[PDB]
């Protein structure tokens, strides 16, 4: 049996993102998958990387270095419980779906904070132990993104550039760095200026794709895939 | 006379980022510039985009859309005071420096939240009124970034890819979209594994560059500059 974690970043249950999230829960649940949703805004999830994230005594009280102290805290089981709650979900998951609207060619800050705080050294990667040897190897990840801009604006000759250009920090710099195999992204362009039937169609496309998600091959997460 | 805003995202005053920020304050202050620092962690700056950001009544209580409601709130002077405090600093600034460590090939979530919440429609851009016609036109912006990875890892043939690849969402998708002219980024690679004298040199390089920052030409912020 499979475990899926959906890390969901939208304020509004009736939003288009909310519908994409609900559809994923329904379809995966129907398949028999174990499903967990981290509804970040509902959780009032803390995005800031601060010394409050380490519940043990710091190694160095003269100079605070977030990466160093969370790495040591992870080894000593001294991380704040909101972080370790999310680590448990990720550790058990076979597939992690991120469901979010694009904010400034990236994830909303609350989701950026989940990346910053949850994927610490010792947990998600180590040195050595990143990219193909990252510590989340054997898991799948997939970005389900919605945009303001249209598909045609997100091409090589459109004002926004190819949509693969903005995926690079998330897919390569984050997911692949932690050792995930990355499934092709689901990009739902410009729902706000689409018709209600068009929105209906983009939702159904997602639901349909999920019916056979476990049969998909990951993408080659390389500079060539993104910029070639 | 010139106004500079430094949006600074580091938890530790004695950090390498803290030193780069302090050097900027000292040098710009010595030049006679008006200098403001938004020390995000010290301000406990709120990164989450929520309905609390709108202090007026929502246009639509059935379905909450953050972009729509902040755009209307901006027009009606009904945004939370932490946002409008930052908008005042940006509105008056001639140069905005972002000083931050790279987190997951991007900005720390607290700074991502300052982008998400501060640069709202009507203020930073409109439709129409983006990229070259963005509403912050006539201002300069500059990213001062520090990394874990080495310069050689951040090349086309290194594991991280060229550093220009990760700059794309920040420089093109955000700064240029709002109409900033973008100065060449300052990238201080791998201070943590550099020697103390090397760190000293990278600090002095920044200080020296700032002596003539007002004489620099902006970069062409294009797909070609980033991926060419
Ligand atoms: C801070 C910020 C930064 C942004 N940065 C960018 C950027 O860099 N690039 C870019 O392109 N865009 C950007 N945007 C735009 C953003 O990506 C979009 O507004 C977002 O993707 C839209 O998704 P949504 O879920 O909120 O849509 P919604 O507004 O919720 O969707 C539209 C309508 O569809 C309805 N709906 C819900 N479910 C269904 C259904 N099943 N069938 C039919 N209709 C349904 C909803 O109720 C809603 O009224 C930014 C927005 C913000 C606020
Ligand atoms: C969540 C997270 C995500 C990350 N993601 C990435 C990523 O995607 N890519 C990547 O490359 N890296 C990443 N990193 C690494 C991160 O970018 C670095 O740790 C950061 O850039 C280092 O800067 P710092 O200011 O914290 O250095 P510091 O640790 O503060 O600098 C090193 C030492 O220099 C000292 N110092 C201060 N001032 C001076 C001075 N004037 N002269 C000499 N020494 C001085 C400090 O006190 C310190 O002890 C990530 C880190 C975290 C926590
Ligand atoms: C919340 C919202 C909803 C939709 C959009 N839409 C677009 O940004 C957009 C802009 C121009 C067009 C061009 N189109 C030409 C034809 N006429 C009829 C419509 C306009 C289409 C979509 C933005 C937002 N808000 C928003 N907020 C912050 C940043 C951005 C953003 C940033 C970078 C690139 N694109 C958008 N966007
Ligand atoms: C807080 C910190 C400080 C430094 C680094 N350093 C590096 O990630 C790194 C990794 C490998 C090398 C290779 N080097 C080979 C030679 N031997 C001697 C040293 C290792 C250098 C730097 C990471 C972190 N933490 C951190 N936390 C989350 C994500 C990332 C991150 C993400 C993507 C790419 N690079 C780093 N990094
Ligand atoms: Zn990759
Ligand atoms: Zn540009």
Author numbering:
A (entry chain A), B (entry chain A): 2 to 229
Please give the exact wording used by the authors of the publication that reports this structure.
We have solved the X-ray crystal structure of NQO2 bound to imatinib to 1.75 Å resolution, which shows that the drug is bound adjacent to the flavin isoalloxazine ring. The complex crystallized in space group I422, with one monomer in the asymmetric unit. The final model includes residues 3–230 of human NQO2, one FAD molecule, one imatinib molecule, one zinc atom, two (4R)-2-methylpentane-2,4-diol (MRD) molecules, and 213 solvent molecules. Steric constraints prevent the bound imatinib from binding in an extended conformation, causing it to instead adopt a horseshoe shape that directs the methylbenzene, benzamide, and N-methylpiperazine rings (rings C, D and E) away from the active site and towards the solvent. A water-mediated hydrogen bond is formed between Asn 161, which is positioned by a hydrogen-bonding interaction with Tyr 132, and the N3 nitrogen of the imatinib pyridine ring (ring A). The conformation of the imatinib molecule in complex with NQO2 resembles this cis conformation.
NQO2 is a cytosolic flavoprotein that carries out the 2-electron reduction of quinones using electron donors such as nicotinamide riboside (NRH). Biochemical and structural studies have demonstrated that NQO2 is a dimer. Dimerization leads to formation of two FAD-containing active sites per dimer, with each active site located in a deep pocket at the interface between monomers.
